[PDB]
Structures are given as C-alpha cells and as structure tokens.
Nucleic acid binder design. Structure first.
Lengths: 52, 141, 124, 183, 148, 149
RNA sequence: GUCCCACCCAUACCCCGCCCUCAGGGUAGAAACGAUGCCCUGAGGAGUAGGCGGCCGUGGAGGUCAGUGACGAAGCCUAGG
RNA sequence: AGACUAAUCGAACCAUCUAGUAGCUGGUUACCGCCGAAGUUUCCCUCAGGAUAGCAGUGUCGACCUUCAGUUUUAUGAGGU
RNA sequence: CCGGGACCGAGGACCGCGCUCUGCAAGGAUGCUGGCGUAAUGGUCACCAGCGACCCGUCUUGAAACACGGACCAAGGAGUCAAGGUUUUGCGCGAGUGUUUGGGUGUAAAACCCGCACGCGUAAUGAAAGUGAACGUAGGUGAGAGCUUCGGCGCAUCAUCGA
RNA sequence: AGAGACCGAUAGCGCACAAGUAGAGUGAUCGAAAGAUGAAAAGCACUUUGAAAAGAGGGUUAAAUAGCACGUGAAAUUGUUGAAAGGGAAGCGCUUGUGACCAGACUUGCGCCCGGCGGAUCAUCCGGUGUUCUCACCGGUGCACUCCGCCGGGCUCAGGCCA
C-alpha cells in the first residue's frame, strides 16, 4: 500500500496550462475537431446578457 | 498574433475527430474536404479558404468559407445550388475557384467531385446473371 | 469498374514459414518463432532445412497491399462509411464487417452499386 | 568480399530538435528555408544551435553583453540563441538592441528602461535576413557543477563525491604525509 | 510506466541479458562495504582517498547557534535598498541625503569586501567587518559602525 | 593475410578480387609491389588495352560518388584546371606519363573485371616462371586483359 | 614420371530487376504539402555473450467514432478464401 | 550392542523465529532492423570467486579544421643472436 | 566487315549530348496476326518420383553422443516495489527557487487561493583560536566560428606566463 | 456504515455451498474437494417389447443440438462411415506430374453521324438578392437549323487469357 499514488507538480506549470486551454477555447476550427456541434451558434465566445 | 492556419495544423496533425486511420491508408470524414484525404492542402477546417460539395435531391450544392466572419460560425458559409445542366454547373464551379485567386489549386478537384455526384444519380442497369463452373454437375441432378 | 493500369504483380514467395519441429508435437502452434538454441541446426543455416524470414523478401512498394484485382481493401460498417469511397472507385474496394445484420447488408450493397464501388463479399 | 574497416556508419550531430514545442517547430521551418536559399553563413550556424539541448545552451548575462560592447561594437546587433539573464552587479546598463530566444522578467525591464529594444528570432529574419552587422555570443559551457567531478583520479585536483564536508569526512590517510602517504 | 522498459524486450531470450558463464548469483563479493582493505582496496584508493584514519581533536556537545554569522560582499550592498529609491541615488537627484543600511535586519552579520563601490556616501551598521571592506567604504565618503 | 602486406594493398586501392589500377614505376613504388608478390599480377600495358578499358569500364569519382563517364562535360568539369577537357586527353595523359599523371590516375575509380574467359593455368598460385599466374610477366599481361575485359 | 588440348560446377567475380540501411542534393512573391511528404544520385548487407531503434498482441482508465447487435453480440469447429 | 525411548535415535515428535544463508546445480515467455567481444595486466587466507586496466555499445559537441598512417624511399644512431 | 543462338523491357508530356540532318538505331519496346473467353492459365490439399536432411534445451576448448532433463494434453508459472545517490532527455521560473506540516474555501479523498519559518544555491580555507578574493578597460602571448568601414574587433574552448 | 483505474470459482481469505465441516494422528496439532436446466416444472399422460433396468411410438417447450449424469462443451484418447499409402522406422526441404476441390477477371465504355419519340428552355435583355466587386442564383422575356432525356441504325478508339 505504500507505492506512490499521487504526484506533485509545480504551481507555476498548473497556471500555464489552464491559461493555454482558455486560449484554445476561442478558436472555432479547434472546437469542430473535438466533436462539438456548433454549426448554429452566433459567436464562438458565446455570452448571455445575465438573464440567468 | 498567436493563432494562424499553420499553427492549427500543428496541433491537429496527429489526431482529430474527423480522422479515419487504418491499414492500407488513412481518410478524413470532413464536410469541407475534397477527395477525403488527410493532408494540409486538403484539410478544409484549418485553412482560411476552403470549398465543399454536397449532393442535393437533383444536383450539387456548393458551400464556401467567408474569411471575414471567422468568429461567427452561424453566418460563415456562402452556399449555392446548381440544378440546371451538367455543363453549366461545371463552368460556374471553375469560375468560383480560379478567377479571383480563391484556392486556384483546388480547381481540378472541385470539378471532378461534382462530376462523380451527378454520375451517381442516373438509373442503374441490371447486372447479368452469374454462371457456374464446378457446381454445374452438382445442380444437373 | 476496372482499376488503374499498373505494373505486373510479383509475390517472390507463397509458402507460410512454418515453425521448426511443430509437425511432431501437438503443443506447439505453427506460428513462426526464432530459435535461440546454442547448437540449433536451423539457426546455423545448415543445408536442407527450413528457411528463415528476411527483409529481402519484401514486395514492391508500387504493388504492396493490393489484391489481384488491383484494388485495396477497406472495411466498412454502415451506409455512411461507404460514401467515403466516392472519389476512390478505381483504387479501393469495400468489405462489409462480419457483425453487420442481414437487413443492413442489402442496404449497403444497393448504395455501393450506384457509386460503382466493387464489393468483395456481396453474394449473400 | 570487400575488406572494409567501417560500414553503415551514422552521423554524429543532431539533425532535428527532440522537443515537441509547436512554436519552435515553426521557427525551424523558417530557418531551414533561409539556409537553403541564402549565401550568408550566419543562417547555417543559427539553424544548428536551435537543435541543441539545454545544457548546450547556457545562459548569458547582461554583464557579458556589456563586456563585448566596446572597441567599436556599440552599433552592432547582439544575437544570442539562449536565455538572457539580468545581472545584479551591473549598476549602469548601456544602450543596446538584443535579439534573444527569451528574456527574464527583470532583464526585459532594464533593457528597455535605458532606451533599448528587445527583438525576437522571427523579427530578426525580417529585418536582417543575411545577418549583416551582427555578432554571435555564447555562455560558459564548462561552468556547471557536474563538470567538476569529471575525470577524478590521483594528481588530478578534481572534486570527490561526499555526503558532507568536514574533518571527519575523508582527509586522513592518503591526504597528508602524517598518515601514510599523499595521493 | 512499465510498458516501455528493457525487461519487456528480453522476452524470448534465455538468461535475460545477464550472461551464460556468469549467471547472476546471489551475493558474490559480499554485502555493503565488505572488503574495504582486502579485495576492494583498488577501487577505494583510486576514488575516495582518505576513508581510513583519524584527524583532529573532538568537540563534545556542539551547539551550532554559537557559530552563526552569514556574510555578504560589498558589491551586492546596493542591492539591499529598494529599486525605486536606488535609481534616484545612482542617477544623481538627491545630492544631500545618505542611506543607512541595517545588515542585521536583512539577515547578515559580517560585511566582506570583494568588488567595487560607486562614489556615493553610505552608512553601514554591521556586527563584523573585514579590514579590506572598511577601507573601500571609507574612501567613498561613508563610515561603518559596530552595532552588536 | 599478414598485417603488413594488408596495409600496402589498402594504399594501392586494391580491396576486392579482380581489381586493377595504374601506377608509375619508381624506386619508391617498386619496393611496395615486391612485398605483395603472392597476391597480385602485373605487367606492361599497350595502347589497345588502355584504350579499351577506359571506354568500357571507365567510371569517375565525383564528390565521393561513382558516376559513369558518358559525356565529355563530366571530364572537363573536374579536370579542366589541369588542361584536360576531353576523353582523348585522359587516355593521352595515362599512356604517356605526363606532368599531371597523379591527378588523372586518381580520378578513375578502380576497375572491376570479370573472371577470364579461358580460365587460368592448372595451378594459379605459383610464380609465373614456375608455371603459375601471379608475379611479373612483362608484355604477356595484354593477353590476360583481353579475357578479363 | 613429365608435357600439351578440350570440357564440368560454389552462397566467389561481371550485367540486370526488387527490398532495406547509410550518405549527399532539389521542392513558397506558394496553381500548396499525411514538409514526419515527394523526386533525383551513390555505396554497403555473415555472427554467440551484449547494446540500441521500430512495431504486433492481452486485462483495465479518460476522450472520440451522433460506431455493431435477439432480422442474432461473445465463444468454438472448419486438407474454404 | 551407541542399544532402546509409538515402523523415527551418534540426541524423539509438534508449532513459531523463517520466504534462515549459499563464491554451488536447474529454469528464465512475441517479431524485424543496425553494430559486435573476452579468457590478458596489477593487488586480495585469492586459485569454481571479486576490484582495476583493456576489448564493446549508445548519447553528443568542436571544425568539415585539410589533419593523419600496423606502408615505401632518403639522411643519421643503438644491439651481440 | 558479315552470320547463328540465349536471357531481359526498369522508366512514362516536351527540355540534353549528337548524327549519315524533308529525318534517325541519339537521356530504357514498339508494330502486325491467330485460337480461346472457360477450370483453359493460376492457387490449395493428398500421393508417387530425382537430390538433400542425425533430438531438442543446457554446462563445455569440443554434443547426434555409451553426458543430464523430457509418456501426452489443458490452465498456473520467474528482474518487481520503496528510500537515498548518479549521468543523460523534455518542461517552468532564473540569483534565486520549492503552495499541500498547516490555514481559507468547495458541486467535497477532486478543484482553487494565502503566508511566517525552513531546505538547497549565492565564499573559501585550517586540527583549532581565526582570518577572508580588482596594479591593468577583470592582465600578457599563440590558435579560433562569425562580423567588418577591409584596417581590424575577436564567443566557446585548448596550452602557457602572471595577479 | 460508505467507497475502489482491486480478484471473477486452479483467481480472491483455508471456506461464494450443512468449512475449521468430512477425514488422518495415542496426543500437541494437520485439514481438503464441491457455483450456472427453463421466463414458468409445463420434471414426459397413454400404447407397445422386456423378469427388471430400460427401448420404440406419442407428448410439453421458442429450443429436449436444454431430460435432474441438465447453459456454452475445446485438447489428449476412442467408435462408425468416406479417401489414400505400406520389401528392417516415421516426419521434413527444393522442383515437376496425376486426382479432387476453388478464388479472380471477362460478359462492355466513351465519342461522332443519321433517323424517331417526349419535355421545357438554350443564346440575349430587364428586375430582386448574395458575394471572392466580378463572378453567380431566382422571376419574367425565348418559342424550334438551339438545348436536354430516351430509343433504333452506322462508324473510330480502348478493353480479358495464352501464344
């Protein structure tokens, strides 16, 4: 039971990657290549006027 | 900037949802892909300018990409349907792709793809009955 | 339809490279295995024994992977997959998977005839 | 038979980067095209140095740059295919323009504060495709902790592997004539 | 990750890369540092010269707090003042005021002198000071004073 | 093969059976050949033999590659600076030992010959005087060249 | 015992085809490319103990094929492809 | 008589410490591609075994540095078979 | 200079070197004709015939051995894990670097945020008390990729003399 | 009490079952093997041969190729039927022959000329909309030497196997 289950990674590298993923969320060609169905959305950074 | 057509090819070079890879060759099931091959030249979803042909009920239907509205996908396709004549449809497609410098290298593939779709809407002839060579003796009884 | 013109096909070999001493014991399969014995007669290439596979038996790059008709096999599973062969009907041939139902089997064959794609296993 | 001493001998230098950075892949494509269709030797040297590993691209400092900015080199462009590091000893920073792979946070601020300009390897090819009026620089390759242990032996004056340092750890026999001999 | 390691490539090859004549037995040569003076002497003298013997006198109940005195050179002295104030002095806008640096508050006890110093008067308060460091700070107009 | 005669054969560029090269006889090279007696056979070529060999088996070393010589532009591009521009000049330089013999001879890749048509003598590893084939045979090497070419 | 003609055959030598390894070149005012691709040119291939590289299968986990199936999934037999 | 003490005696039977140690026997599981050895030097209660140097592979950098050589020629020394 | 025979046909618009120069044998085969369109060509399996072929694994200078293990089939069956070192490859920051002992928070063993100390590094040397790194544009000489106003300036690294 | 990148009946605790059981030893103590019919027993009435066990008909069921020796039913070993070989072993490698069985491919395609049938609509112009700003679509205008589909006849070229 004393094998190494969890791992440790630098907080600097965690923040780099989560910022890289956010940038790739604004690219429409990448969205289609991941299997999403966005053929009928007006703008790819979709924003709603706080109706919810 | 940090994004370009070349960068997107680097990210999606090895694996993407449209890839169909197996033995003897690889294919791509992409809407904007002519010849259905996996290559930078024919990858419609990465290039800024691309072409696509889809069969309609009577003729071909051609969609193109408008570079001005990349961030608005609901209105980023210029579509038109040709259902008048085979020769007339051929001329319009070639002019649409090689008169104003919009992917002039795709002129040959667009015409050929339209020719195949129209060829597939004709009535089919009946295949001749099969013959027997070694089982003829068995069926003689 | 007929396939593209190509150079003649040469195989360079037809036999199957059976495993040494697999014809005397029932516990050994016929799949080839490299003999690692220190004094094995096959590993030492004695005259009059089984041959060993080498890279010099490879086939021409032009005619590799193509069946005697001239096409290359492509495994399909439904009617949406066979439409991927629209532009490749003189180079590729379709083949229905073994777990496809009988009803979907005749739907695929009907669609493939419109496109002119040859089907290897259709008589069913 | 042919009676040769060597056969199927491979090359000895890297021919492509082992890293999978996407942006670095683009940078290699640009300079691979430039070296093929340009006569400037400056481009061929830059291409190979992009393949090298991290220990073969040691950092250079601001002080080392200021050292080579004398005797008529105040107007040339400094190109360093490596990282550039601020130096805490240098109190006054001269005016210069530098093209480097990357800068630290403090090095970038102090360069532009004096009235300089920081470039990029892609911008460098756009302004000076042939590398005219440039000088290349390297860091100290052998200034590494691991190198001091290389080639340990008698009469070599190298550094030994010890878990600690003190009078109880080695010294003694073989390090002084008072106990046997010396090395 | 065990899927890619050299033990997977040894399947099908007898003796698993350890040799036929020498068969990788249990413990040939002994356990640990056995044989330091008898049969492992040749390795223990080419490397590690000085394993055996006694040197120096011994100390009973050593307390390391009595020997705490970190040192700082003189060329890094100006890095102690904050950046915003530092640029004003070097640029030359004050002309009438001098800084007083407290080494103890930054965690130092001895002021060594190794590099050069610009000609601006300063005041340094240190527990210890070297002979060479006192001269350089004094010829720049400054003074060093012991603080305990 | 003993270690010393092996090194000499490497310096003569004879690393394969049935190879051939041209060398100019001096005191420096006569002693090298005399050491490797039981491995080589040599003699004096005539005009026909040197003419036939260059046309049929002539290959040139270009940038470290074996490029067959079929056009005069290949010879001029590499030997032009020494005054040789055609294939007749190359023959002239070799046959009549000229000032630029060394560069011309080294240009040609070592010749590769087939086994003789009529075969060798009954025992081919004695001296030519005893009844073998290896050694110096003077003008009698022309007959051997006809068969092997 | 000595001399002279003709003739027989090795995985060796010469010419040609094909496979792989190594080395050297060409390819963007892009009518462009699985740029890890394609085209042109040259040489080489025996091997225990041992070293390195590339690939094929088995039990599970995340993503994706809007994947197959009671009109028959998995499994098993088959000098049938 | 080293005899007998539950078919067990020159020191009974049962569980645990215990997976007791072994310089000694036996075994060690798919494929293809490239390179390719040693039984010799010095020390050890050492001689069926280890450390040390040698032979071997892989990763590279400095130049493409014009440097080199199990070779010959010419000049000039040493030797006691 | 004229005969006879055998094996082969790689490449796929034009470009080149040349000649006997309305053309050609000159950077790789084309032209005419006949029978058959199926078991005919071809492939698999069984048998006869010509030539070849000692039982595997292992220790050993040497194994087909009168050296050892092996009657047959199905399932199981052997370089693993942790702490501490070391060189090489990828990545983040860089004279600094490391959130997770602990606290705040949460859709709750996940994710996100915060800081005082502390570890390694920035300074060595002696048994010890102790002391503690610039004569010079951080030195002189010979080689050095690259740059250059063509005069020269000269990174990394190697040797050598000094502080 | 809640869970898992854990094992899936030679695995996982010795025990998924009347398991610390049956059994061995004077005794301390040692200690196994063994899960699965079908949705529902609807677990075969009645006739006939036999001393009986059971057999043959006939029944239930989607299925008895599920019958309390019961889901799926591999190999070693054996029976019947069919084919073949054999003068002190058998098996195997290279190359033909005979017999049995068998996968491919071919069975037309394009173009032109003549004749016949059917339809709306080829060039041109006007209006609206989109767009790569010069290229297109829709509505109207055409109205038979133009355009399109089909059928019949004639012609050129190419296309399977062995020579």
């Amino acid at each position: 039971i004393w094998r190494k289950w969890h791992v440790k990674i630098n907080q600097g590298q965690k923040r780099f990657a989560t910022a890289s993923a956010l940038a790739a969320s604004a690219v429409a060609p990448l969205l289609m290549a991941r299997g999403h169905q966005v053929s009928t959305v007006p703008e790819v950074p979709l924003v709603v006027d706080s109706a919810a | 900037s940090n994004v370009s057509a070349d960068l997107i090819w680097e990210v999606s070079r090895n694996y993407n949802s449209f890839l169909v890879k197996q033995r003897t060759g690889t294919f791509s099931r992409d809407a904007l892909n002519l010849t259905n091959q996996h290559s930078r030249k024919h990858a419609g979803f990465v290039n800024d300018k691309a072409l696509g042909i889809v069969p309609a009920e009577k003729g071909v239907k051609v969609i193109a990409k408008k570079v001005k509205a990349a961030n608005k996908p609901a209105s980023s396709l210029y579509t038109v349907t040709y259902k008048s004549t085979a020769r007339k449809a051929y001329k319009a497609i070639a002019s649409q792709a090689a008169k104003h410098g919009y992917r002039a290298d795709l002129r040959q593939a667009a015409v050929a793809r339209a020719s195949a779709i129209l060829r597939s809407q004709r009535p089919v002839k009946p295949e001749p009955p099969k013959k027997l060579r070694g089982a003829a003796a068995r069926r003689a009884a | 339809v007929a396939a593209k013109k190509h150079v003649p096909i040469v195989k360079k070999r037809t036999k199957r490279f059976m495993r040494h001493q697999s014809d005397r014991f029932k516990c050994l399969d016929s799949a080839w295995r490299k003999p690692k014995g220190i004094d094995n007669r096959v590993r030492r290439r004695f005259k009059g024994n089984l041959a060993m596979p080498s890279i010099g038996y490879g086939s021409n790059k032009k005619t590799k992977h193509m069946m005697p008709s001239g096409h290359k096999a492509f495994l399909v599973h439904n009617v949406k997959d066979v439409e991927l062969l629209l532009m490749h009907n003189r180079t590729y041939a379709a083949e229905i998977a073994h777990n496809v139902s009988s009803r979907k089997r005749i739907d695929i064959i009907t669609r493939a005839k419109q496109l002119g794609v040859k089907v290897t296993n259709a008589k069913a | 038979g042919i009676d040769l001493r060597w056969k199927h001998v491979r090359s000895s230098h890297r021919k492509a980067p082992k890293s999978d950075n996407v942006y670095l892949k683009l940078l290699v494509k640009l300079y691979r095209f430039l070296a093929r269709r340009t006569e400037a030797p400056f481009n061929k040297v830059v291409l190979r140095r992009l393949f090298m590993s991290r220990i073969n691209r040691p950092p250079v400092s601001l002080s080392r740059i200021a050292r080579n900015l004398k005797n008529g080199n105040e107007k040339k462009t400094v190109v360093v295919v490596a990282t550039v590091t601020d130096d805490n000893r240098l109190l006054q920073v001269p005016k210069m323009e530098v093209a480097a792979l990357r800068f630290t946070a403090k090095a970038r601020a102090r360069i532009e504060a004096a009235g300089g300009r920081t470039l990029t390897l892609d911008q460098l090819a756009l302004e000076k495709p042939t590398g005219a009026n440039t000088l290349l620089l390297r860091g100290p390759k052998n200034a590494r902790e691991a190198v001091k242990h290389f080639g340990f032996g008698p009469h070599k004056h190298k550094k030994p592997y010890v878990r600690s340092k003190g009078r109880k750890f080695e010294r003694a026999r073989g390090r002084r004539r008072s106990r046997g001999f010396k090395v | 990750p065990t899927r890619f390691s050299k033990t997977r490539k040894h399947r099908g090859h007898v003796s698993a890369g350890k040799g036929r004549v020498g068969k990788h037995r249990k413990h040939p040569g002994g356990r640990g540092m056995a044989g330091g003076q008898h049969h492992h002497r040749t390795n223990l003298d080419k490397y590690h010269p000085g394993y055996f013997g006694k040197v120096g006198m011994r100390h009973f109940h050593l307390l390391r707090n009595h020997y705490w005195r970190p040192s700082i050179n003189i060329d890094k002295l100006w890095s102690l003042v904050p950046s915003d104030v530092r640029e004003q002095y070097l640029s030359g806008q004050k002309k009438d005021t001098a800084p007083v640096i407290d080494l103890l508050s930054h965690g130092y006890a001895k002021l060594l002198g190794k590099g050069r110093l610009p000609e601006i008067p300063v005041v340094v308060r240190a527990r210890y000071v070297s002979a060479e460091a006192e001269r350089k700070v004094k010829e720049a107009g400054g003074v060093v004073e012991l603080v305990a | 093969i003993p270690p010393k005669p092996r090194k000499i054969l490497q310096l003569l560029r004879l690393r394969q059976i049935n190879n051939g090269v041209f060398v100019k006889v001096t005191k420096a090279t006569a002693e090298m050949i005399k050491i490797v007696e039981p491995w080589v056979a040599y003699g004096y070529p005539n005009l026909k033999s040197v003419r036939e060999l260059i046309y049929k088996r002539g290959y040139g070393k270009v940038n470290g590659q074996r490029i067959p010589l079929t056009d005069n532009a290949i010879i001029e591009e590499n030997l032009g600076k020494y005054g040789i521009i055609c294939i007749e000049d190359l023959i002239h330089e070799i046959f009549t030992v000229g000032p630029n013999f060394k560069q011309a001879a080294n240009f040609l890749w070592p010749f590769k010959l087939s086994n003789p048509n009529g075969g060798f003598r009954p025992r081919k590893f004695k001296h030519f005087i005893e009844g073998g084939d290896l050694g110096n045979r003077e003008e009698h090497i022309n007959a051997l060249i006809r068969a092997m070419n």
